[PDB]
Design a protein around this ligand. Structure first.
Ligand SMILES: [Mg+2]
Ligand SMILES: [Mg+2]
Ligand SMILES: [Mg+2]
Ligand SMILES: [Mg+2]
Ligand SMILES: [Mg+2]
Ligand SMILES: [Mg+2]
Length: 360
RNA sequence: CAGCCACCCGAGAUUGAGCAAUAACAGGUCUGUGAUGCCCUUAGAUGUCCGGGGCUGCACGCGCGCUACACUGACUGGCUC
């Protein structure tokens, strides 16, 4: 194992390259499904429980994914699937470590998923004042709270929209993304291929996410994303009650979640922005009562524009794209050997490691 | 503990008044009284009636108010409590 590139969050704070044209499209694929306004309008004092739905996992690297593999080698040299540039676009916000694999084989610069002491699962309360103890195998332990959080954004995603109704079919099918056998539990989740200019052959073939579509008040296609939070043990991290405040002081709840979860919200915001979706839907999920997991209730959903909300997470897309360009610059000197980008967990500085003999 | 804050359900989670202590004030009223002490006046009456005048007088200084200075308006018509 070799050490190649190391940079702190301070350098990323002052890195910028505002060269992002209006994005084009390459191909859009994946059947969509409508939503229910009654499930949206569920509010505090009018509860509704959270059941379990079956999520067909569709996380795959670009190379193995057949739709990308029949388009990556044809044109373009810089490639990055969805929710993967957020790692490089949330460096100054993150405090933990993530792992990703950028392979500079020839002129190709395609990102891929890799695991080295960290996973892709949701991270909760990572950068908060007075962080949670996370000791042993407690209810608030990191892997188990993360597993609970991933449970929620897998189930409620498939519990807010009218899944049982006839799914609208886009013209192109999603090849090999849960298409080998029609399990009939294939969700509304569609994927777009879009290309935009950022620099030296950085026409980025990029996958997108659409967690559903919502019919307009006048009636037309309007894509949406469905992602949700989770409440637990309000005394910790200087929390606030959602069952008493969501109806009339929801702004404070958003404020304290932004204060508590910053890396996570930026991670979501990146995805919701690059997908070009119309509405971002944030569901509010809380435990039945304190100190009791495996039971949750959906306390409401809020609609905000993915761009306006990007302005309200004090995130600049300019410096984000610039730190992306600068990490590609730091990954331009490297060679055919791939690079596992493992940051330093205890002291947050970005790092990467060239893989010996193609280490995976 | 007396209590306080928020919320649910509720017509309503502080409706508004009347009455209102012990002590006082040289507070106001003798111009409310066939309530009243004392003093004054009592046939050219300060009783009472009639006629006329005045309270309203006008260089000025205050107090309670009404109408305004406009176009978020005035005028004309219509319609509705
Ligand atoms: Mg006196
Ligand atoms: Mg008297
Ligand atoms: Mg007379
Ligand atoms: Mg007078
Ligand atoms: Mg007066
Ligand atoms: Mg006039």
């Amino acid at each position: 194992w070799e050490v190649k590139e190391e940079m702190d969050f301070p350098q990323l704070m002052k890195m910028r390259y505002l060269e992002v044209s209006e994005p084009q499209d390459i191909e859009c694929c994946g059947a969509l499904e409508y939503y229910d306004k009654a499930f949206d309008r569920i509010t505090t004092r009018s509860e509704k429980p959270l059941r379990s739905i079956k999520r067909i996992f569709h996380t795959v690297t670009t190379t193995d994914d057949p739709v990308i593999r029949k388009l990556a080698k044809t044109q373009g040299n810089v490639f990055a699937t969805d929710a993967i540039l957020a790692t490089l676009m949330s460096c100054t916000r993150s405090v933990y470590s993530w792992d990703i694999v950028v392979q500079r084989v020839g002129s190709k610069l395609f990102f891929d998923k890799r695991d080295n002491s960290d996973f892709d699962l949701l991270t909760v309360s990572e950068t908060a004042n007075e962080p949670p103890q996370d000791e042993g195998n407690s209810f608030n332990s990191p892997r188990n709270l993360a597993m609970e959080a991933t449970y929620i954004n897998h189930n409620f995603s498939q519990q807010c929209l009218r899944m049982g109704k006839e799914r609208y079919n886009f013209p192109n099918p999603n090849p090999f993304v849960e298409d080998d056998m029609d399990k009939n539990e294939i969700a509304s989740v569609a994927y777009r291929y879009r290309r935009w200019k950022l620099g030296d052959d950085i026409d980025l073939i990029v996958r997108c996410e659409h967690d559903g579509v919502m019919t307009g008040a006048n009636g037309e296609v309007s894509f949406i994303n469905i992602k949700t939070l989770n409440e637990w043990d309000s005394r910790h991290c200087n929390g606030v009650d959602w069952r008493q405040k969501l109806d009339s002081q929801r702004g404070a709840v958003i404020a304290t979640e932004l204060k508590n979860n910053s890396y996570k919200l930026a991670r979501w915001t990146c995805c919701a922005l690059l997908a070009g979706s119309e509405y971002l839907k944030l569901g509010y999920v809380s435990r039945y009562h304190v100190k009791d997991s495996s039971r949750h209730v959906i306390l409401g959903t809020q609609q905000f524009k993915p761009n306006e909300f990007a302005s309200q997470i004090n995130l600049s897309v300019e410096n984000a794209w610039g730190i992306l360009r600068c990490v590609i610059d730091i990954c331009m000197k490297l060679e055919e050997g791939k690079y596992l980008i493992l940051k330093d967990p205890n002291k947050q500085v970005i790092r990467v490691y060239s893989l010996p003999d193609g280490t995976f």
